[PDB]
Ligand binder design. Structure first.
Ligand SMILES: [Cu+2]
Ligand SMILES: [Cu+2]
Ligand code: NI
Length: 310
């Protein structure tokens, strides 16, 4: 699968091209190795990401994530993602998970990149699980083919990130809730996909839109299942005056010391990635909620938010 003499850029037609984002023939020496690499966009003008095709080794790649950003964490050929993904904010565009197949972008929908305000780089994370296939000492070029176009898209994809920052999980503690909430104050977004992220202590993650005190399910997932972007059961609009609300349920069981929010496996995260589309003339590409503005509101959270997925 390694790119040879033809390189990473395929002409599709007048205004479209495929960009292949692949590891430069890497060979992991340990299990659960996270490798990152970057690619500058080959065009300066604004472009739209309208499709993704995975190029994974079905024998060694556990997951892949693709981000857009302006400042990749390294200037090197490739690095361990422990160093970081991007030094500015990494905008997730795509997740590929083993045993949980991705869902296509709706037609007419694209991420805006490049230009004056869009991402100038793609960063690709590859999670290598079982490295028993690397007994060959073979070079791996797993990654993702992205379909770019110059043609403006009627609908712009973006990300609403809900994330905990203050969470403290005391050791042995049966149940710890991490609650996130913000008022929505932009033009309408329609949620079409969601991804959940915790580390090993996470039991369930749920996101809701609350309007006039009524809770509407965006997504609810066990974070110990493959962390792909999952389609929303039914399209959900989030509109001015709505509150977005999310809860991660953790346990402290099995830990001798307290667990707080951080980047390592002995730390936790409570992340819910809400992938939306917006009308192009109304669109903004990213929003983040790191707060809990209506904590008392969580008294009426559906009971399913506290119950593990069977
Ligand atoms: Cu993985
Ligand atoms: Cu994490
Ligand atoms: Ni609608």
């Amino acid at each position: 699968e390694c790119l040879g003499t033809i390189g990473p850029v395929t002409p599709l037609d007048a205004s479209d091209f495929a960009l292949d984002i692949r590891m430069p023939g890497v060979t992991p020496k340990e299990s659960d190795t996270y490798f990152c690499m970057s690619m500058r966009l080959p065009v300066d003008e604004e472009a739209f990401v309208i499709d993704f095709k995975p190029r994974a080794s079905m024998d060694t790649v556990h997951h892949m994530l693709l981000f857009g950003c302006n400042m990749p964490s390294s200037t090197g050929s490739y690095w361990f993602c422990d160093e970081g993904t991007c030094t500015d904010k990494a905008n997730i565009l795509y997740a590929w998970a083993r045993n949980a197949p991705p869902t296509r972008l709706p037609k007419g929908v694209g991420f805006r990149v490049g230009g004056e305000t869009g991402s100038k780089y793609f960063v690709l994370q590859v999670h290598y699980g079982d490295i028993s296939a690397f007994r060959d000492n073979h070079k791996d070029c797993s990654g993702v083919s992205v379909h770019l176009t110059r043609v403006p898209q009627p609908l712009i994809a973006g990300m609403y990130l809900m994330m905990s920052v203050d969470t403290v999980i005391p050791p042995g503690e049966k149940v710890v809730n991490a609650d996130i909430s913000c008022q929505y104050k932009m033009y309408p977004m329609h949620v079409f996909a969601y991804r959940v992220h915790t580390h090993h202590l996470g039991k369930v993650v749920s996101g809701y839109r609350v309007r006039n005190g009524q809770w509407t399910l965006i997504g609810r997932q066990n974070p110990q299942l493959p962390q792909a972007f999952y389609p929303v059961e039914h399209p959900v609009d989030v509109t001015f005056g709505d509150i977005l609300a999310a809860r991660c349920v953790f346990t402290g069981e099995g830990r001798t010391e307290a667990t707080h929010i951080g980047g390592t496996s002995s730390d936790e995260m409570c992340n819910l990635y809400i992938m939306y589309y917006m009308e192009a003339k109304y669109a903004l590409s990213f929003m983040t909620c790191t707060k809990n503005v209506a904590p008392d509101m969580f008294r009426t959270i559906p009971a399913e938010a506290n119950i593990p997925i069977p």
